[PDB]
Design a protein around this ligand. Structure first.
Ligand SMILES: [U]
Ligand SMILES: [U]
Ligand SMILES: [U]
Ligand SMILES: [U]
Ligand SMILES: [U]
Ligand SMILES: [U]
Ligand SMILES: [U]
Ligand SMILES: [U]
Ligand SMILES: [U]
Lengths: 273, 273, 273
């Protein structure tokens, strides 16, 4: 259980080149001193990260960022009794975005990717990016959403005008992910024959660079990288209605009903009932 | 109907210099090849953009940005009945600003300007800048506003203290303008006499660089540039009162009544009536 | 009363070097002309700023910046009568920070510091930094706060589900400080003997570089520097409950009860009572 730079672990080439000169120490006593005059030429691998998944390192933090104005309406009840009065429908085209960086890669050597869906729906519109395990990429996805607020029925007391403001709250969800998976496989190369020294075909596994305890059953080895994200997305649609005689304001959420969000038609009471 | 770089269109000097060498093709067959050995020297113009107006390319977007704290008050009713209790008056000096850039000029050659008033009043205080049609200028205007909230009468139930918070909502209105107008007039210059070549006084209109269809009646030609803006301005003044026994909060807008905004004196009910 | 660069005032070395050559004008008429061939070597001081205090140059400005989501809860009353229903407790670890710069030092020469506590408590958690009088330092202090919201009792009408959102308002308090205090003391040095010129041990006070009127009783002299700040801190904890039949939302402040803020357990009415 546990490991973070595939690249540092692949320096178990160091093992092949050392043990190599160690045999040669019998044939010539100054063997170790030739450490860098002897080149070691990689020629391939089947290195692979299995079941790459991104997951939440910590809980997400959420801030209510801004409110988007969506619409306005005066509704006028010049009657001696209370009336149901209909507001107009609105359309807001608003964009939900997320941007996602890899902060600590998992080594550079082996490529991998994994989708991550933003842990905040609240509208019916999900949002996904991905992370690259092996370089520090900033990827950015997004989605235009059209919120269709239909007419609302608003009870308005007698001799009251009423101001109706509608707005879409936005929320900014930030957090830290960990990139994880189970690395397998081997490299094969050659320590080419130098002067008196013999050629040496090699093949090391990554299993054999750590410890049989750290290693799993199935033979792979766990890796972790780091990554952050920051998304901005719609939350509730609010309708605030204000009675222009008393100036009291009452607040209402208009609930939800591709990339088109339709909202319920509600009947709601203005302050003064 | 339609055109965007006066400057590209003024390269109907190219027309005068070409047609010029075209006549000379009879007298000498290698005329076109002297295209850049022959200089063309402008000497004046009465180019002019008529009725320059800025106008809204798209609807404005509005975000409720921040709330400015304006004041606080505890109001205490240690009586066995409900009392009208007066809050203190406040003054807030707050600044409404707008900044405005030209994003795609209309060509560099001819100067023009046009005022633009920010499409959001909501306080009694308007805000205007302008755009330069011919260079990418950022201009910034602003206005200090002093909001004078008088004493408010607050009904407070028996044996209730009440906390009153007042604040000014700010709103951030951003959008895209288009700079428009009707260009007229001409340039006059000279293709000075070179070696065997004769001098050639010229005068071309801008009308004669496009197409009689695109041209208007009156003879001018329509132009468009681009421009954005971003203003931050006051919207409603809110008074929130909280009943300290139940902790319910009720919300109220205090309506409006040079660069001094006076607000109404309202009578309002604390939660608990 | 009044003074702002100790450093400009210490150029009453200029006084010692001038008056010095003024005596020499008798012995040789071209004395003033040697002004910079004569070196003046400081060797010490007991300069000191007494009772250094930071204080508020203007009132603070406060913006409600963002709301931190703290928790969510559905509470369901599938009974034919009204029920008290308990929400779950939450923990929010949130950080209150302040950053503070010195904008106009008070001269570079003499060191001093003074603590400044942020003029906004509202949680039970104060916040302090300091200012350096003599260089333009940005210092930043902060405090993790854990807000412990216990279970709340929420009256919920019959056949009503109810959504409960809890959030912590943050506020951004910015303003300008003035760094003040009463400077005392002296420098002593030497105008070393050059060619025909005699050595001259000196000791000037700072008192004797301005005017006996500006000077105080006790002999010191008032100084002022400038400095700004910007803190971000928690204000009220809000619980908003929404009745899912009518969609009305009522709002509530949950009042406060080291770096651990415990909150009251309230009994509150959902909309619909
Ligand atoms: U995991
Ligand atoms: U919700
Ligand atoms: U509100
Ligand atoms: U237009
Ligand atoms: U309004
Ligand atoms: U509120
Ligand atoms: U003072
Ligand atoms: U408060
Ligand atoms: U609210």
């Amino acid at each position: 259980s546990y490991d973070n730079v595939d690249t540092l672990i692949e320096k178990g080439r160091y093992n092949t080149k050392y043990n190599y000169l160690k045999r040669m120490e019998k044939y010539y006593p100054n063997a170790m001193a030739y450490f860098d005059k002897v080149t070691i030429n990689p020629q391939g691998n089947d290195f692979y990260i299995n079941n790459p998944k991104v997951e939440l390192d910590g809980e997400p933090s959420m801030n209510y960022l801004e409110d988007v104005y969506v619409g306005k309406a005066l509704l006028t009840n010049d009657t001696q009794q209370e009336q149901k009065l209909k507001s107009q429908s609105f359309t807001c085209k608003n964009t939900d975005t997320v941007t996602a960086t890899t902060t600590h890669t998992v080594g550079t050597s082996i490529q991998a990717t994994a989708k991550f869906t933003v842990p905040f729906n609240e509208t019916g519109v999900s949002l996904t990016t991905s992370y690259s395990f092996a370089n520090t990429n900033t990827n950015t996805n997004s989605k235009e959403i059209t919120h269709n607020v239909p007419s609302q029925d608003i009870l308005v007391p007698a001799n009251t005008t009423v101001e109706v403001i509608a707005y879409l709250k936005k929320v900014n969800v930030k957090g830290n992910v960990k990139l994880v998976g189970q690395v397998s496989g081997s490299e094969w190369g050659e320590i080419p024959s130098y002067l008196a020294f013999p050629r040496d075909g090699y093949k090391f596994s990554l299993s054999d660079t750590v410890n049989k305890s750290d290693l799993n059953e199935d033979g792979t080895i766990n890796i972790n990288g780091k990554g952050n994200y920051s998304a901005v997305m719609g939350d509730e649609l609010i309708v605030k209605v204000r009675n222009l005689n008393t100036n009291n304001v009452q607040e209402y959420v208009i609930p939800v009903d591709s990339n088109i969000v339709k909202y319920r038609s509600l009947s709601i009471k203005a302050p003064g009932i």
